[PDB]
Design a protein around this nucleic acid. Structure first.
Lengths: 102, 109
DNA sequence: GAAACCACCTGTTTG
DNA sequence: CCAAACAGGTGGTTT
């Protein structure tokens, strides 16, 4: 469960979303590379597959593959908010949803 | 001297610019720095007149078909305040280590 | 070919 | 103050 106000770069041709490292280390641990594949679900019940990775050059956690399709379907914009949630029960499943400028 | 100067270039304004890269003339590039022979790219260690050793990455950018120095060039430019129209002279010592050497000269515009 | 993807790089900003 | 983090970039490769 963490939320980010998305930057212009987040929703542009850079095809990447930067996760703040506090939240990345707290809620999404990485094996310690090419990275892992992560499955989330939106309110429509569609399940999105993203690639979660670490860039050691910039020391930053980023979603790359699959983020742009999310941006385009949801018509994300700079200033909107993206909220990551997890299952209440043992299903262990992650959910993604988006609100707009509080 | 103990040093042999290899080549020099009067820096374009983009060499000191936000592009953070020094275009190296292909004529002068294939001559002393052959990239297939590794002189992806390679890291080169060049020492200045102040004694500071500077590490740059030397590669060939197919997009511009340019031989270029790219990583650390901005630091050199910022510390030396390299400006468009100044000159960069690359040199090599005739020693067993054959160390490479760099420093800049003055001239306007 | 175009768009996305990939692994690097850096200048500002800031606790 | 300054190392860290990150918003904004690059060239090259795969889809």
């Amino acid at each position: 469960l963490f939320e980010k106000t998305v930057t212009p770069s987040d929703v542009g041709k850079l095809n990447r979303l930067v996760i703040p490292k506090q939240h990345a280390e707290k809620h999404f641990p990485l094996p310690a590379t090419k990275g892992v594949l992560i499955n989330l679900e939106d309110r429509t019940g569609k399940v999105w597959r993203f690639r979660y990775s670490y860039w050691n050059s910039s020391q930053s956690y980023v979603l790359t593959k699959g983020w742009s399709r999310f941006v385009k379907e949801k018509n994300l914009r700079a200033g909107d908010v993206v909220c990551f949630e997890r299952s209440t029960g043992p299903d262990r499943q992650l959910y993604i949803h988006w609100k707009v400028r509080s």
